């Protein structure tokens, strides 16, 4: 049986097709990026509001890290 549906390869298969630990570093960075991004409402905001929330969080983290030391 055959139809007119074009399929989309899985990301694992795509990495298999395209072929050290630089990949591991990249994937841990992207894991952290997604984990931070999806749990805060950035998809539901505009650009200016998202930028201001970003700088707000960055300032909080920087101040907290400075105080901790």
């Amino acid at each position: 049986h055959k139809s007119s549906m074009v399929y989309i390869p899985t990301t694992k298969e795509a990495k298999r097709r395209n072929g050290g630990i630089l990949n591991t570093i990249e994937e841990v960075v992207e894991k952290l990026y997604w984990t931070y991004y999806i749990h805060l409402p950035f998809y539901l905001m505009a650009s200016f509001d998202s930028f201001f929330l970003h700088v707000f969080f960055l300032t909080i983290f920087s101040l907290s890290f400075f105080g901790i030391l």
Partner: protein, 555 residues
Amino acid sequence: YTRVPLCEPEELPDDIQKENEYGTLDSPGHLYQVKSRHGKPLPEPVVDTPPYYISLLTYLNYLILIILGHVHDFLGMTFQKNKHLDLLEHDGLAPWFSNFESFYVRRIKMRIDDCFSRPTTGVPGRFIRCIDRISHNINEYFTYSGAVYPCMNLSSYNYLGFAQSKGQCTDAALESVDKYSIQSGGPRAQIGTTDLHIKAEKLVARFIGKEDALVFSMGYGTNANLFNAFLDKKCLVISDELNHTSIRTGVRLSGAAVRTFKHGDMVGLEKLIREQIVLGQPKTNRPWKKILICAEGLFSMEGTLCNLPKLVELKKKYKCYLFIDEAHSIGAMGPTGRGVCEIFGVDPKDVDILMGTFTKSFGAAGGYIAADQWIIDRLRLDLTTVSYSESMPAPVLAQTISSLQTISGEICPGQGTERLQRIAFNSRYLRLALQRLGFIVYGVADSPVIPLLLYCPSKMPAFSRMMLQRRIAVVVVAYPATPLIESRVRFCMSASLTKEDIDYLLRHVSEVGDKLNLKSNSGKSSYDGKRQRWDIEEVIRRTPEDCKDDKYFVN
């Protein structure tokens, strides 16, 4: 270039067409036959929950969104009232709608307006063809090129796969177009009746198991105009809290009093019945002239059934009346496809009024009312839509009659049971595979509605857009429609899907839900008591054989 183009059908020399609309069965081992319960009430549900930090994060997200939206509205309305000129007065005329009653739509909904109302073309079969959109200024307005791509359909109500253009029902509709017409005459009471209406009413009444029936041209209209006909302001209606909007509008139009009971709770129902019989009419305390109970065969946001045997018990004990809305149950549930009466073995004589629609599982339009003879005669004399609204056309009646005969086993035997078993196998397979992979899934084992919980407002657009990018079509719902802390994605399984498509879906869903941190299933959703995080290949290999055993389904 700004308006939706009129796409043209391709060539597809009829084999690719027949495979596009209805996938061919691969193995006889992918069918399942369901069994009755012989009048036994359901066990209490075992709905699962996520950890506490998911809920807290959801609350924080909604707080931030509301604060930002209100600040934006106040500043924009007060300062720059030149662009916001459709919310303010003009020479004494009030605006069409105020700014506060439309807060959610233009603040929280408008930013993800591309996940809703996607234009399509062609038959909404196994593969649906979508028209691609480009958004400007974050879904401010869309523009359309001429490109069209097919996606795997998991959104449309096509339970038995009767929506096609090559079967026998399509031929019946084509014959009816030639024979009668596409034009009605008027109301059924004036000139609108034909012999096809009489045949359809007789066949529906025989199929359900009741004595007589009526057919209409809309389901919403049926539910909206029934209670006005047989109710009044001195009666009481005790309806479930999850009922459809049409029932609410129909009850509101009559004038009766309304009291609701919590979904899936019968002790509360009996307590409410006793208290309302004792109390009587408000502010006058005279006896209630009538009491009616409204429910649904299957709630198509939770996937759960209604405890029909116990409802019959209380209605017989306290002398109430029963109304059941079998929109999602008829045709697609039961050993032979008769609804919840077949599932629970209840004789279809204890239910006073039964109604449903041909839209969901028959690939047509309209609705019906089935009851006893004297009730039907009085209603036919008293209903409003029988006197004031136009009757349903000929092609729709032909399609409905052909589909009802096909399911009943009267024409081309062997197809109805095959469809009824394909859908039953597919639903169980997907539910068990998802629950083993590590997600949270609602509903009974056989329901063709498979909710999957997200719990975070920002995971809705991400899931929808990634799935569309991977050529899968889904539907997502949010706070005004579902509880604030439970936003989900709804799958609708048809009998036109093959197990290969389900495996493709499973692989893509597993990867996306791993990436978005959605596998938060507990141990409460397993027959043992231990949490499950199986691998994709193991679950693919071992699920098709284990999905036929009832000991693996906790609910």
